[PDB]
Structure formats: structure tokens, C-alpha cells
Amino acid sequence: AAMRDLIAELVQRYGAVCAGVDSEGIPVAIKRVFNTNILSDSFLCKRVLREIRLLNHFHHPNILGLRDILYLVTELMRTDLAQVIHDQRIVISPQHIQYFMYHILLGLHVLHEAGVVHRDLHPGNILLADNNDITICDFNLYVTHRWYRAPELVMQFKGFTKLVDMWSAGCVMAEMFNRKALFRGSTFYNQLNKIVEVVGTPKIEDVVMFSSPSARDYLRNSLSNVPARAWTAVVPTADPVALDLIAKMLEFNPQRRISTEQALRHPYFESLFDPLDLTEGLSERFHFDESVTDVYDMHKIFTAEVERF
Numbered sequence: 623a624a625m626r627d628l629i630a631e632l633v634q635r636y637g638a639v640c641a642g643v644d645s646e647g648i649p650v651a652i653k654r655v656f657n658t659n660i661l662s663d664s665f666l667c668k669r670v671l672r673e674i675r676l677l678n679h680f681h682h683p684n685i686l687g688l689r690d691i692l693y694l695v696t697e698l699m700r701t702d703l704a705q706v707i708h709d710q711r712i713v714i715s716p717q718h719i720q721y722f723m724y725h726i727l728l729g730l731h732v733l734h735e736a737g738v739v740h741r742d743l744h745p746g747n748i749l750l751a752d753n754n755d756i757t758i759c760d761f762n763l764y765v766t767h768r769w770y771r772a773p774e775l776v777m778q779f780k781g782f783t784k785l786v787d788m789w790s791a792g793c794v795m796a797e798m799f800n801r802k803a804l805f806r807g808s809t810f811y812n813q814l815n816k817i818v819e820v821v822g823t824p825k826i827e828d829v830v831m832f833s834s835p836s837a838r839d840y841l842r843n844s845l846s847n848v849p850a851r852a853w854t855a856v857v858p859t860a861d862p863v864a865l866d867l868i869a870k871m872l873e874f875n876p877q878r879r880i881s882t883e884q885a886l887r888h889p890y891f892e893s894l895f896d897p898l899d900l901t902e903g904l905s906e907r908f909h910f911d912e913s914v915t916d917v918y919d920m921h922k923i924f925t926a927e928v929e930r931f
């Protein structure tokens with residue numbers, strides 16, 4: 623039961639997502655979040671406020687935006703990338719991978735420029751519109767999502783940067799060619815071994831630089847000698863230009879990982895790239911006061927951000 627609650631409000635087909643039509647003939651997506659109260663509990667209210675403030679901060683075609691601002695309204699997205707990859711009947715041509723990647727990276731670029739790190743990018747939160755174009759959601763902070771975590775996150779590193787999103791993006795690129803996720807691990811050790819088997823044994827001096835003391839304790843006697851595999855065997859459907867980018871996105875050490883601008887500028891996107899995409903529709907630095915926490919103090923900023931009925 624969910625549709626009956628909106629009969630007294632305004633339409634039917636983390637929270638509960640359901641489809642429907644708007645006041646006018648527009649296909650929308652309505653998310654309902656109330657209990658697990660959430661909007662009353664100052665901790666979880668701050669998390670919901672963070673999502674609303676983030677969605678309202680951006681106004682870019684590759685980032686999900688609110689259509690009506692607990693009930694939440696956005697445009698209805700046909701399907702997600704996970705469903706397109708995990709449905710072998712639908713074929714993803716290299717031309718489709720190039721287009722998808724260009725839009726995925728543009729969305730990440732928009733977040734990174736505003737100082738936002740997704741931290742959990744996977745095909746499940748890369749949504750596809752009715753017009754086939756890519757949109758990113760769930761940038762506000764199942765088992766398979768741990769297959770897209772950068773080595774520094776697997777190693778519980780506190781000083782992770784926007785570069786974790788590159789590794790995630792690099793994982794979804796190889797997944798579009800292989801039609802099977804790249805690093806399908808079940809443990810801390812086997813997830814790291816699968817990564818190292820493909821990328822090559824990183825220097826000990828580099829791992830200590832991007833691991834928590836406990837991750838170093840787990841890996842203390844865990845010394846590997848594994849050589850770097852040929853990328854042609856790892857991702858066989860990819861051409862040398864696509865493999866060059868994948869390898870650059872999938873750098874163990876984030877200090878060598880290709881930046882959002884550099885990947886967008888790579889020859890792989892030559893036929894699609896326009897330098898204006900790096901600057902158009904960009905939001906300014908996103909600021910959120912995490913220090914402030916109270917009952918009625920949050921409900922006043924809630925009505926301040928919303929202007930449309």
C-alpha cells in the first residue's frame with residue numbers, strides 16, 4: 623500500500639520508488655520515505671536534507687534533478703545500465719559504449735567540479751532516459767556494488783578523493799565490452815587479488831600510502847609477485863584506443879589515475895568531444911553545514927530551498 627496515500631495529496635503504476643503521471647501529461651518518478659520517523663530524527667533528517675540539497679544544487683542533463691520537492695518527484699527513467707548489460711538480447715556496440723562513457727564521465731565531471739564525490743558508482747545508479755541518454759543518481763552518502771570500489775576504498779583509506787569515481791567508471795567500461803563485471807570478488811583478499819592479477823603487483827610503498835593500518839595488517843605477510851596481464855585478454859572486444867583509456871582509468875595508485883578532464887580529452891572520445899562540455903551547465907562548489915543538527919532548525923531550511931508547489 624502506497625498509491626492510496628497520494629489520493630489525499632495530488633499518479634500510480636533508502637525509500638520506496640513508484641511511477642506515475644503528473645498534474646499534466648508528464649511521466650514522473652515518485653519516491654516515498656517516512657520510516658525505517660526519519661524527517662523527525664535529526665540524524666536521518668540531515669541525510670534526507672543532504673539528498674534534496676544535492677539534487678537541487680545541479681542543473682545538468684547528465685545529473686538527476688528534482689521536478690517537485692516525505693515525497694520526492696523527478697523524471698521517470700526507462701531503465702538503468704545494469705539491466706542493459708545484464709540482458710544479452712540487447713547488443714552494446716563500441717559506438718554505444720563510447721556514447722555512454724562520454725555521458726557517464728560528463729556527469730562525474732559536473733560532480734567533481736562542484737566538489738562532490740559519488741563514491742558508489744555502478745551500472746545500477748547510471749539511469750537511461752526514454753531518449754536513451756545517461757543520467758546519474760545516488761551521489762548522496764545488494765553485495766555486487768563492492769566490485770566497483772577503488773583499491774584505496776577496499777583498503778579502507780580515509781583520504782580517498784574524486785579519483786575513486788574514475789576506477790568505478792573504468793570498471794563499468796570493461797563491463798560494457800565483456801557483458802560481465804571485471805572484478806567479481808567476495809572477500810577483501812580475493813577482490814584485491816583479482817585487481818592485481820589484471821593491473822599488476824603495485825609497489826609496497828604505494829599500497830602503504832593508500833591503506834588503513836588494519837588493511838596493512840591484513841596484507842602484512844600478503845606479498846604478491848603477480849605480473850600485469852595483457853589488456854587484450856582482459857577486455858577482448860575493446861580496440862587499442864579503448865584499452866589504452868581503460869588501463870589509465872584502472873590505475874591501482876590514484877596518484878597515476880587519469881583525471882576527469884584528461885579521460886574526456888583522450889583520443890577515445892575524439893568523435894564526440896567538445897571542450898565546451900567541460901564548462902557548460904556547471905554548478906559552483908557545493909556547501910553543506912554538517913555541524914548544525916536540531917529538530918525545528920532543519921524544517922526551516924527545507925521550505926527555504928523549495929519554491930515550486
Ligand SMILES: C[S@@](=O)c1ccc(-c2nc(-c3ccc(F)cc3)c(-c3ccncc3)[nH]2)cc1
Nearest residue numbers: 651652653694695696697698699746747759760
Ligand atoms: C545504489 S542502487 O540500489 C540505486 C539507488 C537509487 C536509485 C534511484 N533513485 C531514484 C530517485 C527517484 C526519485 C528521487 F526524487 C530521487 C531519486 C531513481 C529513479 C529515478 C527516476 N526514474 C527511475 C528511478 N533510482 C536506483 C538505484
